[PDB]
Amino acid sequence: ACALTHCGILHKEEGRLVEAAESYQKALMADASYKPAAECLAIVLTDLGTSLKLAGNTQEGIQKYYEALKIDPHYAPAYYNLGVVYSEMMQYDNALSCYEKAALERPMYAEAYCNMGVIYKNRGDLEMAITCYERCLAVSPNFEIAKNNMAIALTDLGTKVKLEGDVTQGVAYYKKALYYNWHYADAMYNLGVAYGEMLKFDMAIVFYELAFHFNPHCAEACNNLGVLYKDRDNLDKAVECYQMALSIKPNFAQSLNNLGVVYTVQGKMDAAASMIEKAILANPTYAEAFNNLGVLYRDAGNITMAIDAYEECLKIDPDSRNAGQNRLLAMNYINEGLDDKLFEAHRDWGWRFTRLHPQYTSWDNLKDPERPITIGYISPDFFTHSVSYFIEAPLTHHDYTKYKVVVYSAVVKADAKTYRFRDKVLKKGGVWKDIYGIDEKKIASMVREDKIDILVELTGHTANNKLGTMACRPAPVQVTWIGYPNTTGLPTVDYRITDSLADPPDTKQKQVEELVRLPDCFLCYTPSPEAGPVCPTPALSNGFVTFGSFNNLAKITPKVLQVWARILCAVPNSRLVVKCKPFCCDSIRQRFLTTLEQLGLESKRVDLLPLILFNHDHMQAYSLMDISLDTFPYAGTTTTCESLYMGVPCVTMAGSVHAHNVGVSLLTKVGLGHLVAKNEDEYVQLSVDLASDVTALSKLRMSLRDLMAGSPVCNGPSFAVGLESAYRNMWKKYCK
Amino acid sequence: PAAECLAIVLTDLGTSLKLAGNTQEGIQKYYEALKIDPHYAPAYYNLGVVYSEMMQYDNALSCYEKAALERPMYAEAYCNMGVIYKNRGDLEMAITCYERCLAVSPNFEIAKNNMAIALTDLGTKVKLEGDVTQGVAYYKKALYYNWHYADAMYNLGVAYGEMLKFDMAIVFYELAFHFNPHCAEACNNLGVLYKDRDNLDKAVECYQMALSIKPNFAQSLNNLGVVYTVQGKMDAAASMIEKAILANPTYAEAFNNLGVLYRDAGNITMAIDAYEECLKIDPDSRNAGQNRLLAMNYINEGLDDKLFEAHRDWGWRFTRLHPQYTSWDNLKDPERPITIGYISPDFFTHSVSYFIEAPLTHHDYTKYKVVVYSAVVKADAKTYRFRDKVLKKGGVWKDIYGIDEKKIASMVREDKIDILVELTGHTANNKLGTMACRPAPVQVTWIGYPNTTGLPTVDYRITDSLADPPDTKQKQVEELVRLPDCFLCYTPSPEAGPVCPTPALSNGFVTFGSFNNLAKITPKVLQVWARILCAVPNSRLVVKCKPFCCDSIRQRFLTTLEQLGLESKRVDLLPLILFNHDHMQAYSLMDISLDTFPYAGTTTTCESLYMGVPCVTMAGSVHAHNVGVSLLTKVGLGHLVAKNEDEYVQLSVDLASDVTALSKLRMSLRDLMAGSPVCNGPSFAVGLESAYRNMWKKYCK
């Protein structure tokens, strides 16, 4: 048997398997119990079966493997090959059983463990497959394919666990996946998004960049990265990121929408329109694209089409918060108080939102009417924003020994003014909380944990508002004040602060909040220290009066254009300068000029200026004009204050709604009530009267800065006293 | 407008003159421009550049400061200020200048890169001060502006290694290499991390790469030498460590590793020399001191008091820099469930196991509650068998691998251990530092070391009256407690298999053999074995030592034997056998076991006697020498204990002269031992229990 076995081995080494197999079979006939001849015969039979498999004789291979296992069951590789055959024909139970038996006979044959793991993974049993790979690597820790499959399974498991809400375990699984494969793009991208979701943007960026580096075709990573840079106001990088995403996936609807948004912010209106329309074509059910289209139309002054786009969004997504709030905001630009339809719409939206949220019902605030009071101001606008020019007044002038100030800053990107506010608040003993990216319900929990007395929301239905916090009713008194000129539609909001001129006692505009009228002006402008000097009246050097307006375009309704055309026709050799951010786009400028021409006014006189992002020169630009014409039915607020502070008389119009009467309030309280028109005809008459005299106009210009500084509009202390008294009255009301 | 245009043209003229080498004329034209326009920033930028070129950094700073004041949107000026401050060492002002630069120009790639550099240097500084978390934060901020800044990734790897986040450290070292393949340090650290995970092949790859980048990297040379030592490539390890020593003569750890290699290779004298060099470089090197003591134990006949002096000195100093406890809440009760902790890292298939298993198997739990402190690095079926055996009887098993020593002592205190028994000694991965803390009221050493521990804090050493006779002259430290019977209870494995027929009966020649490790086979034992083999016609010696896997050691030993008068053909050198069964069966290859001196076998002698291979031993004046005397006498073979080399030779010749008697004795030896006190588990358990009780009584008194 020994000689026959060695002859068979020698024949096998030459690959002449047939005679070797015959020799081994003869040896088995000579001495069956010779277990080494049996082992060699099983080996040769398995080699024959493998050759037959590779030759396509799969059934003959099966037969040879069964023969081998009849000769030497212990021969694990025959079980391995049988398992492979069972797997290819999808007999997964037979395959797994064969692999398990092979692993019993040979527990160090890693490749079987890997194949079991792969098969189980294809069946969605990620945990079992992972265990199989783990034991495989316990047998051999360098086997590549097994490391790669372990990384894949770990990433799939981390994603599965994360979608169940355990973000931390998902992150741990992704980190382990990168341990088994440090250049697995999927793991990196998943980590990037998990980190981004948990307010860790720097790491998120690094991860998205790595994911793109290792997998250039991860268009999703480029899109996400562009979004993250956009939120950091690095618009150029966002532009490149989205362009790359579209170079990999031209029809990537998300990149189309996001790039459209970025173009909208930059004022490139035509490009924004084109990209959002492409997004709609790519995904007709992409509601957010409709919302962004509505925003684009609103900024371009096409309010009707903006409302239509928001309505399309709300038919596609009834719960779209952004569409509803932007719709209400857009309606505020054109609906003058005649029909109580806007108020009903706000009420209906508020009832829907109050259904979408369960508020609190009790408060632990000690009901002492005379104790000090904790006032929280909550807003995303504690940066260089219009609202910032007014909230600065109370933050500086509160008596902090009686009204403890808490600031909830949701500012996406701080700046020197945010830091200035925090420094003032902290130096006077106030709490400052940055709450960007924190769930609204967690905001409500925080507000309740901070024991606030009066919560003042300053945003209303504008961008990045926190009305979800207000719906929880975390505080015992909720107020809106300056960010929005109409009712918010929240029954949980108790009061809206105004004055007796913005909302006369006989106002017919219905609102849910009780109006709190301050004795003076409800606004206290804090002038920028960079305002610089007043320039001489241009009329003295140009000989002609230049009217102007630095309001937005959504506020300049066709009717305003008609009235301005009447003004310019009634005053020979006069000019109009209009500065707004979307004039950069040539198409919008052209439509605006054509609209003015249709009213019979020669475009040449009209100077349309785009926006120049520079505070000092932005404020100094009022040296280019002589008389500001306010817009209606949405009066200016900050623009009127800036005009007055520069010495430029500003003519406003009175109407039936708060947004219309804000200009009346400011002008009357600064002492220029003779510049408040009641109707379009008086508006024209007042403008002509101002234009007819230039020396008195120059004296007025030279006096206006000092007049305003001496007025209630700049009397920070008096405003603070009045506002504190109002708050105390609210508190006493609460105690009763 | 004319003044502005003239200033512009004069500045262009000055720049051309500078590029033409007329630097002073350019400076003069720039000053003329600044007289025509004190606000023309480009002139200020030029002045700053030239002032830097002449290394007049203060004027450059002042000029770029006027440039900042005139207009706050000169990104280049802020960048240049940051570079200048970085050059002066100040990183705060540099960071601030770069921050302004990025505040006016965010996408300024140069300013991002320089900000990343400065942030990484600052993180390194802050980390060097102690605050590692802030260092990590600075490195992450660096990876924000330069996500591919390899140095930030490497330094993160370092910090995570210090933080013990080994998986993240691996990832960050691999990324560091990917973004900078010249970072040989990253390669080295990655390999180290992989070695610590018992993945030797990857570690070797990493070190070979580190050396392919930096051939004279001393650290990588040392680490690769160590890895080859673990793999047993003696010559390779030697060469590597020698190169490391040549690259850095103050790399103490390289000397320690060289000493370990020499000791494992049996070259004890030069191993001692290497440890002395290490202790010359670092005097508190725990590893060098303990390896030195262990190595001295292999060749030191009791003819001096230098070994005891060295042990006492080392122990004294060690304890000196070592806080310890001073009070115990252990109830002073002589009739209670005294808690006895056994602490050791070698519970797996190790020589000690074959003896410590006996008490674990036969120990009255209802009186001496046993707690096990297993510091095993890698467990196995035998570890699990021991854990199960202890547990099913009510013992407490605690795995303590990878826990700080002081925390081990604290845990022992919370565990209310009464008698703490250290079973390791001056070997490797010992916990003698825990013993120095004296966490338990009684400290005992028994089987892990054959000589004094030198620590005064250890109270007792377990022995018998044969290994350490009452009149022994060896001065030690601990109090000798002599058990009545053999201090050892061997429990044979269930893999010993049958005793086979006598070799001398079938092969026609007597074969001597030894399974002791090579470190114990001192030349003085080779000469004696050569005399034995010359005295016995047609004799064969079989030696199986690990280091023989390397052919160099085999050749050297064969040459040494040939120089002594023994034909190398007459010498059978066997390497390590992979499996237990056949390794144990290898006792069929010899007729007589030869014990070594001045360090006898312990486990090997018991194995030789269990397989039927009569053993000849030598008496001496040290425990390690007399262990063989203890075993043979207690088995009943005291007539096989020589008193001198001449008696050793005579006994070996006599045993070889009567093949018949040898065969009979071997056929009887297994049952003789099974009936002997060596295999009388109950009697040993009773003796050890009585000894513990006596120790406790002494303590309470």
mmCIF file of all heavy atoms in Angstrom, chain A residues 141-142 178-179 182 202 205-206 209-210 213-214 232 234 236-237, chain B residues 107 112 143-144 147 167 170-171 174-175 178-179 197 199 201:
data_model
loop_
_atom_site.group_PDB
_atom_site.id
_atom_site.type_symbol
_atom_site.label_atom_id
_atom_site.label_comp_id
_atom_site.label_asym_id
_atom_site.label_seq_id
_atom_site.Cartn_x
_atom_site.Cartn_y
_atom_site.Cartn_z
ATOM 1 N N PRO A 141 -5.908 37.177 10.792
ATOM 2 C CA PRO A 141 -6.243 38.608 10.870
ATOM 3 C C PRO A 141 -5.762 39.455 9.701
ATOM 4 O O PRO A 141 -5.906 40.678 9.761
ATOM 5 C CB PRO A 141 -5.532 39.052 12.159
ATOM 6 C CG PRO A 141 -5.114 37.810 12.855
ATOM 7 C CD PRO A 141 -4.869 36.830 11.774
ATOM 8 N N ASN A 142 -5.199 38.854 8.657
ATOM 9 C CA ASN A 142 -4.694 39.596 7.512
ATOM 10 C C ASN A 142 -5.490 39.345 6.241
ATOM 11 O O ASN A 142 -5.272 40.044 5.245
ATOM 12 C CB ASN A 142 -3.221 39.247 7.260
ATOM 13 C CG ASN A 142 -2.272 40.183 7.978
ATOM 14 O OD1 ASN A 142 -2.684 41.203 8.527
ATOM 15 N ND2 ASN A 142 -0.991 39.839 7.977
ATOM 16 N N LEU A 178 -13.987 51.701 9.650
ATOM 17 C CA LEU A 178 -12.736 52.305 9.215
ATOM 18 C C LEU A 178 -11.534 51.629 9.850
ATOM 19 O O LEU A 178 -10.432 51.709 9.299
ATOM 20 C CB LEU A 178 -12.706 53.794 9.548
ATOM 21 C CG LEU A 178 -13.676 54.703 8.805
ATOM 22 C CD1 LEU A 178 -13.456 56.131 9.247
ATOM 23 C CD2 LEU A 178 -13.510 54.576 7.306
ATOM 24 N N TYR A 179 -11.715 50.968 10.992
ATOM 25 C CA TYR A 179 -10.631 50.148 11.522
ATOM 26 C C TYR A 179 -10.354 48.949 10.627
ATOM 27 O O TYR A 179 -9.192 48.591 10.409
ATOM 28 C CB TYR A 179 -10.942 49.674 12.937
ATOM 29 C CG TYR A 179 -9.962 48.632 13.413
ATOM 30 C CD1 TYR A 179 -8.596 48.845 13.324
ATOM 31 C CD2 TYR A 179 -10.401 47.424 13.923
ATOM 32 C CE1 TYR A 179 -7.698 47.890 13.744
ATOM 33 C CE2 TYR A 179 -9.510 46.462 14.346
ATOM 34 C CZ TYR A 179 -8.160 46.700 14.254
ATOM 35 O OH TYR A 179 -7.270 45.744 14.677
ATOM 36 N N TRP A 182 -9.532 51.417 6.341
ATOM 37 C CA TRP A 182 -9.411 52.843 6.614
ATOM 38 C C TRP A 182 -9.758 53.705 5.410
ATOM 39 O O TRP A 182 -9.914 54.916 5.574
ATOM 40 C CB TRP A 182 -8.005 53.182 7.121
ATOM 41 C CG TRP A 182 -6.895 52.798 6.217
ATOM 42 C CD1 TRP A 182 -6.194 51.634 6.226
ATOM 43 C CD2 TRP A 182 -6.327 53.602 5.183
ATOM 44 N NE1 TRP A 182 -5.232 51.654 5.248
ATOM 45 C CE2 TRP A 182 -5.296 52.854 4.592
ATOM 46 C CE3 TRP A 182 -6.602 54.878 4.689
ATOM 47 C CZ2 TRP A 182 -4.535 53.339 3.536
ATOM 48 C CZ3 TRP A 182 -5.847 55.357 3.643
ATOM 49 C CH2 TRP A 182 -4.825 54.591 3.076
ATOM 50 N N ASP A 202 -16.991 71.021 11.729
ATOM 51 C CA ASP A 202 -15.608 70.896 11.276
ATOM 52 C C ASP A 202 -15.281 69.451 10.913
ATOM 53 O O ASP A 202 -14.820 69.160 9.799
ATOM 54 C CB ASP A 202 -14.660 71.413 12.356
ATOM 55 C CG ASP A 202 -14.715 72.920 12.500
ATOM 56 O OD1 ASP A 202 -15.576 73.546 11.851
ATOM 57 O OD2 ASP A 202 -13.899 73.477 13.264
ATOM 58 N N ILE A 205 -17.143 68.282 7.817
ATOM 59 C CA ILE A 205 -16.468 68.731 6.603
ATOM 60 C C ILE A 205 -15.276 67.841 6.294
ATOM 61 O O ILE A 205 -15.094 67.397 5.156
ATOM 62 C CB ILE A 205 -16.054 70.206 6.734
ATOM 63 C CG1 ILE A 205 -17.301 71.091 6.764
ATOM 64 C CG2 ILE A 205 -15.092 70.605 5.620
ATOM 65 C CD1 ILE A 205 -17.022 72.558 6.942
ATOM 66 N N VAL A 206 -14.407 67.625 7.279
ATOM 67 C CA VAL A 206 -13.227 66.802 7.022
ATOM 68 C C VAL A 206 -13.641 65.430 6.506
ATOM 69 O O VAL A 206 -13.014 64.872 5.597
ATOM 70 C CB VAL A 206 -12.366 66.693 8.293
ATOM 71 C CG1 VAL A 206 -11.201 65.749 8.075
ATOM 72 C CG2 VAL A 206 -11.867 68.057 8.698
ATOM 73 N N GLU A 209 -14.956 65.613 2.892
ATOM 74 C CA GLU A 209 -13.814 65.780 2.002
ATOM 75 C C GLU A 209 -13.070 64.469 1.812
ATOM 76 O O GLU A 209 -12.684 64.126 0.691
ATOM 77 C CB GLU A 209 -12.865 66.848 2.542
ATOM 78 C CG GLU A 209 -13.510 68.189 2.858
ATOM 79 C CD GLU A 209 -13.401 69.188 1.722
ATOM 80 O OE1 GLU A 209 -12.673 68.918 0.744
ATOM 81 O OE2 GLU A 209 -14.029 70.261 1.819
ATOM 82 N N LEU A 210 -12.864 63.715 2.892
ATOM 83 C CA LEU A 210 -12.204 62.421 2.753
ATOM 84 C C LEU A 210 -13.037 61.464 1.909
ATOM 85 O O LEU A 210 -12.506 60.760 1.043
ATOM 86 C CB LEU A 210 -11.934 61.828 4.134
ATOM 87 C CG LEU A 210 -10.853 62.521 4.964
ATOM 88 C CD1 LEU A 210 -10.838 61.976 6.376
ATOM 89 C CD2 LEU A 210 -9.486 62.363 4.324
ATOM 90 N N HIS A 213 -12.550 62.305 -1.521
ATOM 91 C CA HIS A 213 -11.192 61.967 -1.930
ATOM 92 C C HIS A 213 -11.078 60.502 -2.325
ATOM 93 O O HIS A 213 -10.555 60.175 -3.396
ATOM 94 C CB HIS A 213 -10.219 62.291 -0.798
ATOM 95 C CG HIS A 213 -8.799 61.935 -1.102
ATOM 96 N ND1 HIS A 213 -8.032 62.639 -2.004
ATOM 97 C CD2 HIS A 213 -8.003 60.954 -0.618
ATOM 98 C CE1 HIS A 213 -6.827 62.104 -2.066
ATOM 99 N NE2 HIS A 213 -6.782 61.080 -1.234
ATOM 100 N N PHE A 214 -11.544 59.602 -1.461
ATOM 101 C CA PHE A 214 -11.416 58.177 -1.748
ATOM 102 C C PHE A 214 -12.426 57.702 -2.785
ATOM 103 O O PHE A 214 -12.115 56.817 -3.589
ATOM 104 C CB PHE A 214 -11.548 57.381 -0.455
ATOM 105 C CG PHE A 214 -10.364 57.530 0.448
ATOM 106 C CD1 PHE A 214 -10.414 58.361 1.547
ATOM 107 C CD2 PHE A 214 -9.196 56.845 0.189
ATOM 108 C CE1 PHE A 214 -9.325 58.503 2.368
ATOM 109 C CE2 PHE A 214 -8.107 56.985 1.009
ATOM 110 C CZ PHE A 214 -8.172 57.815 2.100
ATOM 111 N N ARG A 232 -22.147 78.309 6.485
ATOM 112 C CA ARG A 232 -21.064 79.133 7.000
ATOM 113 C C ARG A 232 -20.848 80.399 6.181
ATOM 114 O O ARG A 232 -19.834 81.078 6.360
ATOM 115 C CB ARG A 232 -19.782 78.299 7.055
ATOM 116 C CG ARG A 232 -18.639 78.901 7.859
ATOM 117 C CD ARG A 232 -17.412 78.006 7.796
ATOM 118 N NE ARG A 232 -17.779 76.599 7.874
ATOM 119 C CZ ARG A 232 -18.045 75.956 9.004
ATOM 120 N NH1 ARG A 232 -17.886 76.533 10.183
ATOM 121 N NH2 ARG A 232 -18.471 74.700 8.949
ATOM 122 N N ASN A 234 -19.798 80.834 3.380
ATOM 123 C CA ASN A 234 -18.754 80.711 2.364
ATOM 124 C C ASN A 234 -19.415 80.280 1.055
ATOM 125 O O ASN A 234 -19.284 79.148 0.588
ATOM 126 C CB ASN A 234 -17.684 79.729 2.812
ATOM 127 C CG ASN A 234 -16.410 79.850 2.011
ATOM 128 O OD1 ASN A 234 -16.427 80.265 0.856
ATOM 129 N ND2 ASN A 234 -15.292 79.484 2.621
ATOM 130 N N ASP A 236 -18.916 80.857 -2.052
ATOM 131 C CA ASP A 236 -18.147 80.427 -3.214
ATOM 132 C C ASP A 236 -17.851 78.936 -3.145
ATOM 133 O O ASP A 236 -18.054 78.207 -4.126
ATOM 134 C CB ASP A 236 -16.843 81.218 -3.302
ATOM 135 C CG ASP A 236 -17.072 82.693 -3.527
ATOM 136 O OD1 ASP A 236 -18.246 83.108 -3.591
ATOM 137 O OD2 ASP A 236 -16.078 83.439 -3.640
ATOM 138 N N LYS A 237 -17.431 78.457 -1.974
ATOM 139 C CA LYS A 237 -17.140 77.039 -1.819
ATOM 140 C C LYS A 237 -18.388 76.204 -2.046
ATOM 141 O O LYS A 237 -18.326 75.147 -2.681
ATOM 142 C CB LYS A 237 -16.548 76.774 -0.437
ATOM 143 C CG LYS A 237 -16.116 75.330 -0.206
ATOM 144 C CD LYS A 237 -14.923 74.919 -1.061
ATOM 145 C CE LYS A 237 -13.645 75.628 -0.649
ATOM 146 N NZ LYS A 237 -13.181 75.189 0.692
ATOM 147 N N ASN B 107 -11.222 81.986 1.296
ATOM 148 C CA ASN B 107 -10.696 80.956 0.408
ATOM 149 C C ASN B 107 -9.222 81.159 0.068
ATOM 150 O O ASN B 107 -8.779 80.765 -1.018
ATOM 151 C CB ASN B 107 -11.534 80.902 -0.868
ATOM 152 C CG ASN B 107 -12.869 80.222 -0.655
ATOM 153 O OD1 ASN B 107 -13.037 79.441 0.280
ATOM 154 N ND2 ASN B 107 -13.829 80.522 -1.518
ATOM 155 N N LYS B 112 -4.867 79.349 4.773
ATOM 156 C CA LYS B 112 -5.391 78.137 5.393
ATOM 157 C C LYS B 112 -4.263 77.183 5.753
ATOM 158 O O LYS B 112 -4.218 76.645 6.865
ATOM 159 C CB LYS B 112 -6.400 77.462 4.464
ATOM 160 C CG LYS B 112 -7.481 78.389 3.942
ATOM 161 C CD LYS B 112 -8.372 77.698 2.934
ATOM 162 C CE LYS B 112 -9.272 76.675 3.595
ATOM 163 N NZ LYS B 112 -10.211 76.057 2.622
ATOM 164 N N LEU B 143 -6.907 70.197 10.939
ATOM 165 C CA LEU B 143 -7.528 69.392 9.896
ATOM 166 C C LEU B 143 -8.777 70.038 9.337
ATOM 167 O O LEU B 143 -9.346 69.516 8.376
ATOM 168 C CB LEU B 143 -7.891 68.009 10.432
ATOM 169 C CG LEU B 143 -6.764 67.019 10.685
ATOM 170 C CD1 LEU B 143 -7.352 65.721 11.183
ATOM 171 C CD2 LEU B 143 -5.953 66.787 9.432
ATOM 172 N N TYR B 144 -9.200 71.166 9.897
ATOM 173 C CA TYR B 144 -10.320 71.888 9.306
ATOM 174 C C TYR B 144 -9.867 72.690 8.092
ATOM 175 O O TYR B 144 -10.456 72.574 7.013
ATOM 176 C CB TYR B 144 -10.970 72.814 10.334
ATOM 177 C CG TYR B 144 -12.019 73.727 9.742
ATOM 178 C CD1 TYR B 144 -12.789 73.332 8.659
ATOM 179 C CD2 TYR B 144 -12.203 75.007 10.238
ATOM 180 C CE1 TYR B 144 -13.726 74.175 8.108
ATOM 181 C CE2 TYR B 144 -13.138 75.856 9.692
ATOM 182 C CZ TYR B 144 -13.896 75.435 8.628
ATOM 183 O OH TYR B 144 -14.831 76.280 8.084
ATOM 184 N N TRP B 147 -7.457 69.647 5.504
ATOM 185 C CA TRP B 147 -7.903 68.291 5.803
ATOM 186 C C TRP B 147 -6.882 67.229 5.414
ATOM 187 O O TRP B 147 -6.967 66.103 5.913
ATOM 188 C CB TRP B 147 -9.256 68.039 5.132
ATOM 189 C CG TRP B 147 -9.241 68.085 3.644
ATOM 190 C CD1 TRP B 147 -9.477 69.175 2.865
ATOM 191 C CD2 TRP B 147 -9.005 66.995 2.749
ATOM 192 N NE1 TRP B 147 -9.390 68.837 1.539
ATOM 193 C CE2 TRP B 147 -9.101 67.501 1.441
ATOM 194 C CE3 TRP B 147 -8.713 65.641 2.927
ATOM 195 C CZ2 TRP B 147 -8.917 66.705 0.318
ATOM 196 C CZ3 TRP B 147 -8.530 64.854 1.810
ATOM 197 C CH2 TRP B 147 -8.634 65.387 0.523
ATOM 198 N N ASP B 167 -7.662 51.856 18.015
ATOM 199 C CA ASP B 167 -8.245 51.751 16.680
ATOM 200 C C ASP B 167 -8.173 53.082 15.941
ATOM 201 O O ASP B 167 -7.775 53.137 14.767
ATOM 202 C CB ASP B 167 -9.691 51.273 16.784
ATOM 203 C CG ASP B 167 -9.801 49.873 17.350
ATOM 204 O OD1 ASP B 167 -9.155 48.954 16.805
ATOM 205 O OD2 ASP B 167 -10.533 49.689 18.344
ATOM 206 N N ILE B 170 -4.593 53.775 14.945
ATOM 207 C CA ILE B 170 -4.253 53.049 13.724
ATOM 208 C C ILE B 170 -4.786 53.785 12.505
ATOM 209 O O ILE B 170 -4.071 53.982 11.514
ATOM 210 C CB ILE B 170 -4.786 51.607 13.792
ATOM 211 C CG1 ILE B 170 -3.944 50.790 14.770
ATOM 212 C CG2 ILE B 170 -4.788 50.959 12.412
ATOM 213 C CD1 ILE B 170 -4.535 49.451 15.113
ATOM 214 N N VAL B 171 -6.062 54.166 12.541
ATOM 215 C CA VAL B 171 -6.644 54.854 11.391
ATOM 216 C C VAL B 171 -5.847 56.114 11.074
ATOM 217 O O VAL B 171 -5.527 56.395 9.913
ATOM 218 C CB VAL B 171 -8.127 55.173 11.649
ATOM 219 C CG1 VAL B 171 -8.682 56.081 10.566
ATOM 220 C CG2 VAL B 171 -8.930 53.896 11.715
ATOM 221 N N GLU B 174 -2.401 55.417 9.594
ATOM 222 C CA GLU B 174 -2.517 55.000 8.204
ATOM 223 C C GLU B 174 -2.824 56.189 7.304
ATOM 224 O O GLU B 174 -2.261 56.311 6.212
ATOM 225 C CB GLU B 174 -3.595 53.931 8.068
ATOM 226 C CG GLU B 174 -3.274 52.643 8.811
ATOM 227 C CD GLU B 174 -2.813 51.526 7.895
ATOM 228 O OE1 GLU B 174 -2.216 51.822 6.840
ATOM 229 O OE2 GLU B 174 -3.040 50.347 8.238
ATOM 230 N N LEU B 175 -3.712 57.081 7.746
ATOM 231 C CA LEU B 175 -3.994 58.279 6.959
ATOM 232 C C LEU B 175 -2.771 59.185 6.870
ATOM 233 O O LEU B 175 -2.490 59.757 5.812
ATOM 234 C CB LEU B 175 -5.174 59.033 7.570
ATOM 235 C CG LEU B 175 -6.544 58.367 7.435
ATOM 236 C CD1 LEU B 175 -7.580 59.110 8.252
ATOM 237 C CD2 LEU B 175 -6.975 58.285 5.984
ATOM 238 N N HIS B 178 -0.709 57.754 4.257
ATOM 239 C CA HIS B 178 -1.330 57.998 2.957
ATOM 240 C C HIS B 178 -1.132 59.420 2.454
ATOM 241 O O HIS B 178 -1.027 59.631 1.241
ATOM 242 C CB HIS B 178 -2.826 57.714 3.027
ATOM 243 C CG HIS B 178 -3.480 57.618 1.687
ATOM 244 N ND1 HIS B 178 -3.269 56.566 0.824
ATOM 245 C CD2 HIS B 178 -4.325 58.462 1.051
ATOM 246 C CE1 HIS B 178 -3.968 56.758 -0.280
ATOM 247 N NE2 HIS B 178 -4.616 57.904 -0.169
ATOM 248 N N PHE B 179 -1.082 60.406 3.345
ATOM 249 C CA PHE B 179 -0.933 61.792 2.927
ATOM 250 C C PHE B 179 0.499 62.278 3.018
ATOM 251 O O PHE B 179 0.771 63.437 2.695
ATOM 252 C CB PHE B 179 -1.834 62.691 3.774
ATOM 253 C CG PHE B 179 -3.292 62.539 3.466
ATOM 254 C CD1 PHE B 179 -4.178 62.146 4.447
ATOM 255 C CD2 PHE B 179 -3.772 62.771 2.192
ATOM 256 C CE1 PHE B 179 -5.513 61.999 4.167
ATOM 257 C CE2 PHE B 179 -5.107 62.625 1.910
ATOM 258 C CZ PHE B 179 -5.978 62.237 2.897
ATOM 259 N N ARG B 197 -1.135 43.970 19.448
ATOM 260 C CA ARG B 197 -2.329 43.178 19.198
ATOM 261 C C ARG B 197 -1.986 41.775 18.708
ATOM 262 O O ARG B 197 -2.839 41.094 18.132
ATOM 263 C CB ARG B 197 -3.219 43.903 18.191
ATOM 264 C CG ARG B 197 -4.646 43.400 18.114
ATOM 265 C CD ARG B 197 -5.400 44.088 16.991
ATOM 266 N NE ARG B 197 -5.968 45.359 17.425
ATOM 267 C CZ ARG B 197 -5.329 46.520 17.395
ATOM 268 N NH1 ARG B 197 -4.090 46.620 16.946
ATOM 269 N NH2 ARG B 197 -5.952 47.612 17.831
ATOM 270 N N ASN B 199 -0.499 40.787 16.250
ATOM 271 C CA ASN B 199 -0.493 40.658 14.793
ATOM 272 C C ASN B 199 0.922 40.907 14.274
ATOM 273 O O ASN B 199 1.232 41.929 13.664
ATOM 274 C CB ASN B 199 -1.500 41.620 14.177
ATOM 275 C CG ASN B 199 -1.827 41.278 12.743
ATOM 276 O OD1 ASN B 199 -1.018 40.685 12.034
ATOM 277 N ND2 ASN B 199 -3.018 41.659 12.302
ATOM 278 N N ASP B 201 2.790 39.724 11.890
ATOM 279 C CA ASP B 201 3.142 39.854 10.479
ATOM 280 C C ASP B 201 2.961 41.287 9.993
ATOM 281 O O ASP B 201 3.839 41.843 9.317
ATOM 282 C CB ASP B 201 2.290 38.901 9.644
ATOM 283 C CG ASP B 201 2.636 37.449 9.888
ATOM 284 O OD1 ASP B 201 3.804 37.162 10.222
ATOM 285 O OD2 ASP B 201 1.737 36.591 9.750
#
